[PDB]
Design a binder for this molecule. Structure first.
Ligand SMILES: Nc1ncnc2c1ncn2[C@@H]1O[C@H](COP(=O)(O)OP(=O)(O)O)[C@@H](O)[C@H]1O
Ligand SMILES: N#Cc1cc(-c2cc(C(=O)O)cc3[nH]ccc23)ccc1Cl
Ligand SMILES: O=C(O)[C@H]1CCCC[C@@H]1C(=O)O
Ligand SMILES: [Cl-]
Ligand SMILES: [Cl-]
Ligand SMILES: [Cl-]
Ligand SMILES: [Cl-]
Ligand SMILES: [Cl-]
Ligand SMILES: [Cl-]
Ligand SMILES: [Mg+2]
Ligand SMILES: [Mg+2]
Ligand SMILES: [Mg+2]
Length: 264
């Protein structure tokens, strides 16, 4: 029913967020292990992001998919808001990529398949994530990808602007430009992730914000020699300036490079 902080024993920090921290926690009666995303009311209020927090909570609450992190509940006290999340025990894809440097084709196709299944479910409800990046991709007990952090999620179509000075690396041209956008934004982010998984760095990475913006807007990227023909084909289809030219998620799931390398 109605949770309070006294119902949990808090453990180690699991990760740092923009508006507070995520902690491992145990519900006192059941001993059930979960993650508490803690946000500071004063920081949320100064930034004026309460409306986006309401969307994170309302959207994530109603999603039910094995590759989407569950949001079980929420509560608040005088200074903080607490999101009760499903705990992802194998950490982030971000950490996995720092350890391994780059992923082989099998691990990449498997993660892309899991991501495409999760996004296909979101898009069936016109929910667009818009913040698909390695730090927001968690790993379950079976090493399965779980999409998390619905902080920027909205119902499609939308023209809302997400980050003002944060990383642009995963954003499509229509989002960085402030244009109307839809489900196709997640398809572009899928292409950026596929490239980063195989190469170790996102395709439009640059020293400055303006140079990253320029690269994204002109779709300026090249492949290192080791990237195979099949991976180049899928990435080139996803990274199209025109969102209408981006494939459907069923086309990604049936791509010959995906079917040849996916774990299933
Ligand atoms: N349920 C979870 N299980 C494990 N680690 C988590 C969980 N949720 C978040 N984290 C960790 O905390 C970080 C921040 O959480 P996130 O929800 O993305 O916050 P923010 O909206 O501030 O980005 C993640 O990038 C990850 O490192
Ligand atoms: N549970 C919960 C929750 C609480 C707030 C909130 C409440 C108040 C309040 O009722 O006083 C003040 C606030 N300032 C920033 C957030 C915020 C927003 C979302 C959720 Cl999910
Ligand atoms: O910290 C959060 O969960 C969200 C609060 C609303 C604004 C966006 C923000 C985020 O995920 O970046
Ligand atoms: Cl605002
Ligand atoms: Cl380690
Ligand atoms: Cl919305
Ligand atoms: Cl140039
Ligand atoms: Cl241009
Ligand atoms: Cl070549
Ligand atoms: Mg995050
Ligand atoms: Mg977030
Ligand atoms: Mg990097």
């Amino acid at each position: 029913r109605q949770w309070a902080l006294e119902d949990f024993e808090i453990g180690r920090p699991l990760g740092k967020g923009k508006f507070g921290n995520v902690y491992l926690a145990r519900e006192k009666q059941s001993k059930f292990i979960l993650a508490l995303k803690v946000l500071f009311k004063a920081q949320l209020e100064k930034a004026g992001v309460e409306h986006q927090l309401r969307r994170e909570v309302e959207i994530q609450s109603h999603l039910r998919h094995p590759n989407i992190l569950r949001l079980y509940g929420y509560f608040h006290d005088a200074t903080r808001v607490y999101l009760i999340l499903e705990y992802a025990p194998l950490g982030t894809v971000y950490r996995e990529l720092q350890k391994l440097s780059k992923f082989d084709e099998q691990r990449t196709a498997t993660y892309i398949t899991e991501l495409a299944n999760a996004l296909s479910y979101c898009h069936s409800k016109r929910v667009i994530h818009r913040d698909i990046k390695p730090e927001n991709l968690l790993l379950g007990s079976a090493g399965e990808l779980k999409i998390a952090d619905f902080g920027w999620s909205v119902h499609a179509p939308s023209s809302r602007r997400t980050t003002l000075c944060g990383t642009l690396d995963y954003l499509p041209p229509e989002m960085i430009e402030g244009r109307m956008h839809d489900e196709k934004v997640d398809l572009w982010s899928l292409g950026v992730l596929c490239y980063e998984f195989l190469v170790g760095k996102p395709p439009f990475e640059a020293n400055t914000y303006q140079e990253t913006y320029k690269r994204i807007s002109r779709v300026e990227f090249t492949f290192p020699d080791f990237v195979t023909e099949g991976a180049r084909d899928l990435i080139s289809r996803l990274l199209k300036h025109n969102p209408s030219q981006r494939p459907m998620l069923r086309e990604v799931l049936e791509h010959p490079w995906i079917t040849a390398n996916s774990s299933k």
